[PDB]
Amino acid sequence: GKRQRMVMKLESDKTFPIMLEGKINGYACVVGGKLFRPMHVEGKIDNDVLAALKTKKASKYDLEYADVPQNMRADTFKYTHEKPQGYYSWHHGAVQYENGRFTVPKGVGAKGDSGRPILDNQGRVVAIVLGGVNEGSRTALSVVMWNEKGVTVKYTPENCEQW
Amino acid sequence: GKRQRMVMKLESDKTFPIMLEGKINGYACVVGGKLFRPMHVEGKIDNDVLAALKTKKASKYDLEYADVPQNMRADTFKYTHEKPQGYYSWHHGAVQYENGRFTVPKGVGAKGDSGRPILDNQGRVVAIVLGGVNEGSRTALSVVMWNEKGVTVKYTPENCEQW
């Protein structure tokens, strides 16, 4: 109920969709002065400022990143590495964090909702949704996250389908 | 209030947008049996009749022009050269004509609203908006117009940005 409204209030201005002949196939992320955007989502950036840049690539970690200018670094997402197990907020409701794995209940999940960040009860991004795999009743996510040392860890289960 | 409604009633059928993969970047003008369309706005004409033609180019004046057929010349805009100083109607409200210069108050003006004609209190096109430059609080326009002799004069201030 109110969780989706809080997601729409937090991700209103900072989330920009990716257009491809009128089709919405992905979402970029503006956090820490960086613009995260995946490889398989191909299209034009809806924002005029973020589209006229050059994104350095990382095909192993499946991420394109760039440098957000200084006049927009204050209006970004927050990020942290301290995460316990339990529940977190996602755009379609809740997501479970168990044994270092993000799980989403079924019914939701198609092609197009790639790049949506995972939020917490405070308002900090803990993961970035990149892919998903159907596991019985409860699907698992293939995402990226950080740690205490500062190494971007990409978690990928078996036989995932890119969204 | 009612000025925008009069602009929408006058520019309903005669104004056709320019599409580029679903994005509206410019507007052509059908006046005097001629189809005015700028250089920097690139895309396909939404009208089926106006798209299957050949437009003669003028890069110095920044105008492509063509010949509207006789079955559509009655449903065009009006044009004149007699203009006093003061106020005129524009799609986002009012525009000031002072010292032979068109000025628009700030807050409005982005990439995409190029080619909108400037109307008067009677319903005649006096100028065609091509570009704009931010001057203090009140922006100036880089437009084209006519005169009593019949020479198309292009007015361009310093350091303009094309829209």
Added chain:
Amino acid sequence: GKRQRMVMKLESDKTFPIMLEGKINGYACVVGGKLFRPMHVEGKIDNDVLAALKTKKASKYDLEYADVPQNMRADTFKYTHEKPQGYYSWHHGAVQYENGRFTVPKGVGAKGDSGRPILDNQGRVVAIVLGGVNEGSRTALSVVMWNEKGVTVKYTPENCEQW
């Protein structure tokens, strides 16, 4: 009235419009387990299932035509060889059938009107509209249809327009 509403209920499920860049150019019909598409209409079928299927062409009868997948075979239209004189249904009102000629009262029928299946007093397709000509105060059509033997028959009046 009443006749057009059940036709809208049928066309919402099985008649699929094509996707030109901003508009609709034609309508793919799914009848008997064989997808039909007119040739002069160019674009993309709205379903991603019906888009990937490669079509065979029949230039004498102006129709691309491929085979529909096995799940979709029950959810197709039905076709009838026997048509008596009188009144049949169509998306734009009613259509007269007289001396083997599907004719329509004028004012309707233009570009983007192609592949619309002419239904009957039961809900079965008897013809597929490909265009027509204005025969005075009442326009006739250029349809393909079927006969008792199982032979696709195309009728076309003089100087028809590919709608």
Added chain:
Amino acid sequence: GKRQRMVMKLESDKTFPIMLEGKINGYACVVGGKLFRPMHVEGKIDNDVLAALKTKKASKYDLEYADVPQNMRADTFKYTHEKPQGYYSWHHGAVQYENGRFTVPKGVGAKGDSGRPILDNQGRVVAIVLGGVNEGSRTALSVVMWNEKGVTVKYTPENCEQW
């Protein structure tokens, strides 16, 4: 629900389940004075007299025909060849017969319900269900039946699964 009562009250005397380890795999049908049993169903006949027989094989039509003793020739299904279009009465409700094909609405039809007869509004067997394939919202059936000449005909749709 009234037709299903008729089917159950006619199957209570003349239909025998083929049990393997107690689990139902198929149904022997005693129609017209001759025992019928499909090939791929494994198990034994529930009736003790019918289980001690020498069923002659017929591997093409997926049937194992036998003969009925003379004291049991009156306790058989009656049958016919006459089959106009419309509805017939299966074990789970109704079954549509259109264009020479028996179709059931989906969901029902799994491993075990094979060999069940299809009845008419008089109480005569017109088909014996062997298998079928799910064509989306409706399941076509692979049955054997008869004709006016007195010839056993098997119909088989594409990619049918043996039930």
